[PDB]
A paper describes a structure:
Mtb fructose-1,6-bisphosphatase (MtFBPaseII), the enzyme encoded by the glpX gene, is the third component of the glpFKX operon involved in the growth of Mtb using glycerol as the sole carbon source. MtFBPaseII comprises the only FBPase activity in Mtb and is closely related to the class II FBPase from Escherichia coli. The MtFBPaseII monomer is a compact, globular protein with two distinct α/β-type domains (I and II) arranged in an alternating multilayer fashion to form an α/β/α/β/α-fold five-layer sandwich.
In addition, we present structures of F6P-bound forms for two variants of the active-site residue Thr84: an inactive (T84A) variant (2.3 Å resolution) and a partially active (T84S) variant (2.2 Å resolution), the enzymatic properties of which have been described previously. The two variant MtFBPaseII structures differ with an r.m.s.d. of 0.265 Å; the r.m.s.d. between each variant and the apo structure is less than 0.4 Å. The F6P-bound structures contain one magnesium ion in a position that is proposed to bind FBP, coordinate the 1-phosphate and stabilize the transition state. This magnesium ion is coordinated to Asp79 OD2, Glu208 OE2, Asp82 OD1, F6P O1 and glycerol. In the T84S mutant, the O7 atom of the carboxylate group of malonate is 1.1 Å (0.8 Å in the T84A mutant) from the O3′ atom of the ribose moiety of AMP.
Residue numbers in the entry:
A (entry chain B), D (entry chain B): 0 to 310
B (entry chain A), C (entry chain A): 0 to 318
């Protein structure tokens, strides 16, 4: 199962050639393409539940597309070739290539509501989370558990007009903020890894990114909590007549409930978790993380690829 | 004089409490204050040549202020408490706290003109620059002298409307661009250090920032070329009235001329060279670089600061 | 087939509990057992070509034993549970757990003779070796082809009475020696990897160890040359009776000939390549290398093993 | 005061040229020589209390030799150009170049007894140490504090016939052992640093090395305890009529009692704390640690020295 790392390795190597060239679609589509090629060489029966979208506007890794050898139990397949293609195109930090796999039918439905509100923290402080409490009370309880003062805390938040109130409320408590322009899968995993410089992720981001992060959290530990975030009353009603209680707090296991979860990622640009891909004459080096829920084993994998063998 | 790193460590630690708090002046002010206190306890006599500004719009580290306990040969002093207070106040990457020292009277005057066109590269390509040439020609010349493909080169550039043509021209060359929103001292240093991922810095930034980057380039090797870049005709005459040859190409040694040059910097937020201030139960870590032109020795310094108490908190691991 | 790294991780973790406990056979036995269990759950069909020994003096991983769940193309299997049980049992540096796999019938027979004279180097100097020449000549040839000074070269050598002349000759050359007390699979790999600090391995060690080192060198690049080294006339005829040309120079591909070669290793104690097993409240870390000749891809793998429970212990940081 | 790192940098660079050349005295004396040259360029008034020995058999850094500029308060100077010159000469790991400085008269007398029995552990478990208890009880109490099982513990012990009983007793408890052929300054500092792989140092080693280690422990935290270890009844009587209670447990502050302690070290060969010196065409890189008791600041310093500037 470790062999699934070659999928994000291939995605990151493809996107790595487009880093800093200012073409979002070029790099994104090249990563999609390398990953779809490599996943269909892998001994698995998978169905894309999270990918590039519906087949009418996404030719590759559309929702429902079957992937893999064809061998093995059919399972849920979530893929994010680049978590924030703009970071890749501008040469910014913390762009990652991501993939998760769970038991079929155990990944929360990514299409119910576009956005969800999120909070995430690592294993030491996971027990104190309450996304219905004000962010200030989450910060103080998390800080006390970590033996930090509140002014030592660092909260990762997407830089968005919608987060003006949240940003104001975090600042009022005294904690530092790490504003990111994109990439709250990376932000969420960083909140849960030790000595990353990020102690907490908060705010609204993509529902599919919330499920991908939960897959990671299932394997490495920590918690994410979420609540669906209808944009308008239309999506609010669509959600209610799909069956959802909007007072409902989703825990990690509500987003990904399988017993067999797999997650891996490979760095595209340098981030606070993974170094970006580096190209050399002889080849190139990728930096990846790989993890499984059943063992709880976490692997850091640095790979030196030899494409050719020069004079 | 490794002790001067404590100036940037103090400035970074002070600014660390303001990261992401959306108050650029609070953070600068905190950094300014901490650096001034620490600099007046070191055994240098210095005059602030590059600082906050002039005696009236800047209450601390103003141009001309004396710094240091009192003893030592009088020397030129340059400090940038945060290179890009906005990276600090939003919690974005590559904010650093910067200090440079050089022999007295050896630093280019930073009030000549506000802005300066720049191009900087590391030692491998240091004799190949021509800032009067178009960027395409510079990229090609630097690529060939490093036996690299143009499509493999990365240019660091400030993301500004004034750089629409420069950015287009780098891209049409086939080179890559790392777009920064602020911080071309850090970008200049990143270009000059060998295995950084950045081959080149180009574009118009602040004149004081250009001179500080020159001090670092003096110690670590490489070159920067620059020209003054007046913003309108009033400034062009303001400069010309002062005797400036607005066609002169300024080199590294034009900006900082002495043979005793010192540079150090400390990470405020995480960057491509220095990690930012990291907080722990017992204290914090800072990540600094210290450089000296006389010897050419470069030092990467990682420090744990106990805030405070002698083993009442667990031990912390580094790097 | 990255899954095979779990074989050496299991062997290292088992041996980890015996480090410094002064019981070489307990540690080997623990490692042997753990590797056999884990290897029989992977999807290979293999025959043990290099293992503990013959069916009667070795109860587990004996020569000829079949391994793997049952499916897969039959292939050659080499395992060294600890390369130097004595480094393990005293808690000294550079103990590793080793596995190699190659196409069936492609591994040199390890019972031909117990010992083998060896010299190994990385890809830069791979065509310059001559094991029939004196070491002085080899050191000089390797130095020149890497544009290095002889006085800068480092030779890894087993500390043995039988190596008094070899050691003297390296020293008189002006080269350096890293003296190891055991472990010339690790020494061979250290010589072959580029920026390791070791330029060369030389001397007589075990024949099975030479073949395992060849499998790694097949994947990562470089060369080993060897000759069989009988310990007395009885063994010389024992070899010669078997059809061995005791004057043949064996190369890398003589020892391991297939085109599908796999090698992986895991640190038991801390070494110049792999960290040893490290223990934590929630579990342990292992440090492995995995290599494949077909693609030439080299993987450094750091793993945290939860022993056990899902977030009941603090998070651990790596590398 | 950080400028004192250049003394161990110079010692390690000098010894670094002799690494792996099989000449103990060559490398040792070259390190002594580089360090004595560089210390006399430093603004300090110092007197060698720990060095190469008495002046009749040690020309440089003998006991009582005055070192430094001559400027500043006179202080205690302890130096160990290489902690185990055999490691340097054979190309073995964990050879370090070491220097400590304290207030004059505050370093315990290195010449009273040749050997002392030692135990050392880091800041988290320092409070449980009792060198008069059996080693097994120290191991279990240290393990419990660290939240480790006893089989997770690793004890550093000098490989010596005198330690046969200790080695047997540690093995009987179930803990692992890291046997070192030389260098229990390095062993002691490693026991006190986190994530070094060593959790405890135990056994008898040189009294001067015990005082140098205590200097380090004064700055970084942890504890060392010691008891003098007379070889014979002669040294036992010499110690008694010098005034020493041999039932006395020496704590860290009994070995180095100043309020102003400084300690630094530079790696000679690669160790579990510091990388060894690496030589390049342009120059060389040293790896050092520097620490002060009054602030408790610990610095890791990687230096890239440019001796020349080639074609
Ligand atoms: O850009 P939006 O619409 O605010 O949505 C945020 C989402 O976009 C991304 O930044 C990139 O697609 C995700 O990481 C994040 O969840
Ligand atoms: O922000 P401006 O006015 O375009 O000028 C750029 C200057 O500002 C900074 O980004 C920070 O003040 C400097 O690094 C740079 O020299
Ligand atoms: O110990 P001997 O008999 O000299 O042979 C050396 C062999 O022993 C080992 O050191 C460990 O058994 C091997 O690495 C090496 O091949
Ligand atoms: O070699 P001995 O006499 O047992 O003494 C041990 C001492 O020798 C050293 O290994 C090197 O001088 C010290 O680290 C240690 O304290
Ligand atoms: Mg995304
Ligand atoms: Mg600035
Ligand atoms: Mg560079
Ligand atoms: Mg062996
Ligand atoms: Mg090598
Ligand atoms: Mg010593």
């Amino acid at each position: 199962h470790m062999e699934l790392v070659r999928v994000t390795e291939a995605g990151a190597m493809a996107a790595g050639r487009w880093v800093g060239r200012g073409d979002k679609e070029g790099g994104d589509g090249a990563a999609v393409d390398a990953m779809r090629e490599l996943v269909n060489s892998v001994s698995m029966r998978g169905v894309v539940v999270i990918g590039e979208g519906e087949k009418d506007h996404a030719p590759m890794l559309y929702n429902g597309e079957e992937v893999g050898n064809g061998d093995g139990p059919e399972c849920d397949f979530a893929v994010d070739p680049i978590d924030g293609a703009t970071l890749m195109s501008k040469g910014m930090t913390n762009a990652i290539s991501v993939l998760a796999v769970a038991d079929r039918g155990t990944m929360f439905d990514p299409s119910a509501v576009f956005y969800m509100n999120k909070i995430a923290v690592g294993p030491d402080a996971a027990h104190v989370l309450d996304i219905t409490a004000p962010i200030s009370e989450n910060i103080r309880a998390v800080a006390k558990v970590k033996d930090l003062s509140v002014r030592d805390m660092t909260v990762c938040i997407l830089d968005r007009p919608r987060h003006a109130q949240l940003i104001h409320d975090v600042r009022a408590t005294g904690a530092r903020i790490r504003l990111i322009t994109d990439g709250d899968v990376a932000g969420a995993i960083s909140a849960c890894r030790p000595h990353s410089g990020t102690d907490l992720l908060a705010g609204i981001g993509g529902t599919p990114e919330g499920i991908i992060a939960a897959a990671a959290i299932r394997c490495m530990g920590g918690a994410i909590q979420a609540q669906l975030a209808p944009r308008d009353d239309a999506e609010r009603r669509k959600a209610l007549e799909a069956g959802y209680d909007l007072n409902q707090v989703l825990t990690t296991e509500d987003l990904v409930s399988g017993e067999n979860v797999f997650f891996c990622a490979t760095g595209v640009t340098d981030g606070d978790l993974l170094k970006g891909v580096r190209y050399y004459p002889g080849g190139c080096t990728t930096h990846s993380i790989v993890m499984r829920s059943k063992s709880g084993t976490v692997r850091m994998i640095e790979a030196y690829h030899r494409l050719s063998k020069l004079n």
